Design a protein around this ligand. Sequence first.
Ligand SMILES: [Zn+2]
Lengths: 221, 362, 112, 104
Amino acid sequence: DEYFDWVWDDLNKSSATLLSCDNRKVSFHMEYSCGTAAIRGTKELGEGQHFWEIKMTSPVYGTDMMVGIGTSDVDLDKYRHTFCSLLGRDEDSWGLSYTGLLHHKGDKTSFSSRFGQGSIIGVHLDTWHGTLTFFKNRKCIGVAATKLQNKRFYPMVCSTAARSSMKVTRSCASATSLQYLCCHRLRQLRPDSGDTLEGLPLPPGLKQVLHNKLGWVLSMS
Amino acid sequence: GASKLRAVLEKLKLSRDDISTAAGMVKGVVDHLLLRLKCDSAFRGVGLLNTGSYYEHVKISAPNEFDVMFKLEVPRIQLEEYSNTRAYYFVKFKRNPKENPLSQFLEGEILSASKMLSKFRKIIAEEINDIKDTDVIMKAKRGGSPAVTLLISEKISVDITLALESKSSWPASTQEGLRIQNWLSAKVRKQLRLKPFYLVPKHAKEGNGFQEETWRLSFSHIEKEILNNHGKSKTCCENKEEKCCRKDCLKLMKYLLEQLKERFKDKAHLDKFSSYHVKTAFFHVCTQNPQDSQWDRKDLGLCFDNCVTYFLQCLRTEKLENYFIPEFNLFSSNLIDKRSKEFLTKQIEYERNNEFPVFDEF
Amino acid sequence: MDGEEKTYGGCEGPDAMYVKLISSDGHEFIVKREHALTSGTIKAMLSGPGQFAENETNEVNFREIPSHVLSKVCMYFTYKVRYTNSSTEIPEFPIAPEIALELLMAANFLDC
Amino acid sequence: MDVFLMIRRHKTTIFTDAKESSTVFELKRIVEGILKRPPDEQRLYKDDQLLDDGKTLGECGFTSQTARPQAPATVGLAFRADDTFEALCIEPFSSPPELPDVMK
Ligand SMILES: [Zn+2]
């Protein structure tokens, strides 16, 4: 895969987590687990476009394990000694729980089905129009948030299972261009087929670069 | 991690046979007590509520502390509420021809459970010395309902309780309970709705004192009956392929609750919780999910978690409704302190998030 | 705002504020200076020698781009120059899907 | 406040962002600033109907509602043919290709 674009912040993480494999794998509570533990990303998403998906490796359990986005105004170690959902508790953060429910602004909205060990979850972000999209097991679930203009964000994950970890496998970014918007429009006009290159004689090089840029768009509907 | 749950299940299973080996001693003792009571005039009609299963066991890891419940049929009575509790009742004898089981306990206009238990103790003490092939000692009181405690030699201990019975129709206070219609269809609901109900004695207490003479509805036989015939159809678990794991998920939770109390026995702050609360929550859960397809042997995991999540949410919201009296709130602040409630929430969540560390000591 | 003076009426020389774009079919679209500089090819070619003179004709002809494609290019240019870093909610860019199926070749042909 | 509009004549097809309170004569002034054609020589129309130079675009039916970001309203422009109305020199755009069935 193409080199990932950000790591979990070495200087910004809760007082109970260890990081490994060039920080690609983050591990939560290798002993007592007596509170919530959380981390942020290093790169800011306020400009351009972004996309990344996270692969799970450990059995799921506990109060809540959630993947989402938020600002830097939220504190990490405020729940160092308490079991709680940190993501989505305030208007400045969002979160999707493994139980198939979404947290935002301190409320709960059921969004999708549950997932656990071995599952792959994908998130698509479009800051220019301020819309956010979630993907699961290389399938489309649906749009979750919109009207997020002028706001700056970092990616966060929160955990509460001991003996458990999460692992970012791919991280890339791109700028707004015709290779973004026109191909999204084409996929909206070609949702039935799994592949979109069929019937298109366009050069293989631009084909491969548009894979590396928006592979899900050509392979998702 | 269902491997640990299956392993502890087998470990609990392997000690099943030792009960019947020692059951003969207690069988003989309760038989001698039964004949002794039957020669008396006060309790000429006392019988056995579970013939063929003549013992009841409350603790899942206490093969030496038996429990037995004697039934005592009563022909015709009238009941009334106490200060609008909707779970505690009085009793009265309304009209009968010349047939008096025992009216000498009638004081004022209430049959006296205090005198009931007072004579009940005296009969047991005057009888117990008659046994000569086994040393038996009768131990002090521990509660309103288990007013008698019987200890055999040193190991076997039994507490005896008594209950009344009546064939009259169930009162209107339980009209909305037992929402089984979606689970086992209304036909079974209607036929079990005419089986008798049992009134056990239980004192009422307040800040300025305690009011001793009060009764309470009991449904242990029906509670066992649904669990015995849990299947949506007659054929559930009748073949090796269709087995369902409804039964194990309750004995699992009893063991957890007993273990937590054992580990925190010093401060005694968790001594107000029993297995009744565990059983009620599981019954609510299975009413919520009546389909048999949700209880396959493979998973066990989502069902145990649903049980613990339901109990946790009930504990947080301070709401727990009795399965037969839908208005009764056992978790109300009148009975259980919020301090102990939050203590138990903290402990249960810690165990859930640490993957039940207490089960590893076994 | 009205009656802009600029002390000469413009800066059509080294700071050419209007440049002229002719399509293959003859359709003519004007763009402001930063609109022209947005496309890499236009800003690269405008940097050529002699093009900074006052009398140079600020004209570019696209013999390979028809009217509709050039119109959509100008549309995107105006959109991005006006609501760049927009504080208010940014409106969508909906084109009819029977007419916008070909805009892919515009990106790599014009380097925009 | 500015409104997104567009002005077209023959080859020319020019977008504009004049303020709503501006006048049609101000549109002529802008066209003069762009292509050195004096306001007097210019003539503006809507659809194919005559218009007055003193009227404002607000009363000419062009407002922010017509200023949709996806489609600014079109304003007709004409250059005086010596002394009279010039002919319809507008040239239609190229035909669009037919979409195949598998995108249908
Ligand atoms: Zn079954």
